[PDB]
């Protein structure tokens, strides 16, 4: 609706970089421990992106010490500060959910080099 | 008008003993 769309538009942020699934991304998130506020870095691979405007979100999978961790970030939430892209995966699928089953040498993807 | 022929057993075989 016009009323809703206008309401969400004012809450946007224009500093959202353009990234695609398969791109290695490090997302900086705010962390609060009682009264102190710190920056925590989460680096991984974007395996799915959901575009819905103010409700847009993306999920990042990283291989930790033993098992993988998947985190879903709300793109326009104040918790996320900045998003930076290191690699440009040369995938051709919107959703990289098949990477969950794969591991080791089979979880790597090529470089777009574009 | 005419009696049936098959005349199957209508009663069910389930004795309540």
């Amino acid at each position: 609706s016009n009323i809703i769309k206008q309401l969400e538009q004012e809450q946007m942020k224009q500093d959202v970089p353009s990234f695609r699934p398969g791109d290695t991304v490090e997302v900086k998130v705010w962390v609060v421990e009682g009264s102190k506020k710190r920056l925590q870095a989460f680096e991984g691979v974007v395996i799915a992106i959901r575009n819905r405007g103010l409700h847009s979100a993306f999920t990042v999978r990283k291989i930790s010490n033993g098992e993988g961790v998947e985190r879903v970030f709300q793109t326009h939430s104040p918790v996320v500060d900045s998003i930076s892209v290191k690699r440009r995966g040369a995938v051709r699928k919107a959703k990289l959910y098949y990477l969950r089953e794969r591991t080791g040498k089979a979880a790597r993807i090529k470089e777009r080099l574009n | 008008n005419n009696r049936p022929v098959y005349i199957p057993r209508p009663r069910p075989p389930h004795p309540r003993l």
Partner: protein, 122 residues
């Protein structure tokens, strides 16, 4: 989402490797355990040299769930497996000396300080 008969991995080094949840504590007719709920478990296979042997019942606390946890801003954290930490049945007191793998911050209840301190991440 941990319920009865669920397999869990062991984050600590108490000698247990796989455990079965046999009861969810904290309420009558409780269905499944959350991120940091106490549960009663039985060890299904452990280290022969460990201090805990097979077929013993003792409490446990969940630290990681496949279903995941929900953050107040809508974010979620998901893991590839379910893990827990062993206990002492009288006082919570994780018996392990070190815990492997990430641990979420939902366990900061002014009590799990030992778990978080030993956690390599968060």
């Amino acid at each position: 989402m941990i319920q009865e008969q669920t397999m869990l991995n062991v984050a600590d080094n108490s000698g247990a490797r796989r455990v079965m949840c046999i009861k969810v504590l904290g309420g009558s007719h409780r269905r499944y355990a959350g991120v940091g709920d106490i549960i009663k478990i039985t060890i299904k296979e452990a280290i022969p040299r460990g201090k805990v042997k097979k077929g013993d019942v003792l409490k446990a606390v969940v630290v990681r769930t496949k279903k995941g946890v929900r953050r107040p801003d809508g974010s979620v954290i998901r893991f590839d497996g379910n893990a827990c930490v062993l206990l002492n049945n009288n006082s919570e007191q994780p018996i392990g000396t070190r815990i492997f793998g990430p641990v979420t911050r939902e366990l900061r209840s002014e009590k799990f300080m030992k778990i978080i301190s030993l956690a390599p991440e968060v």
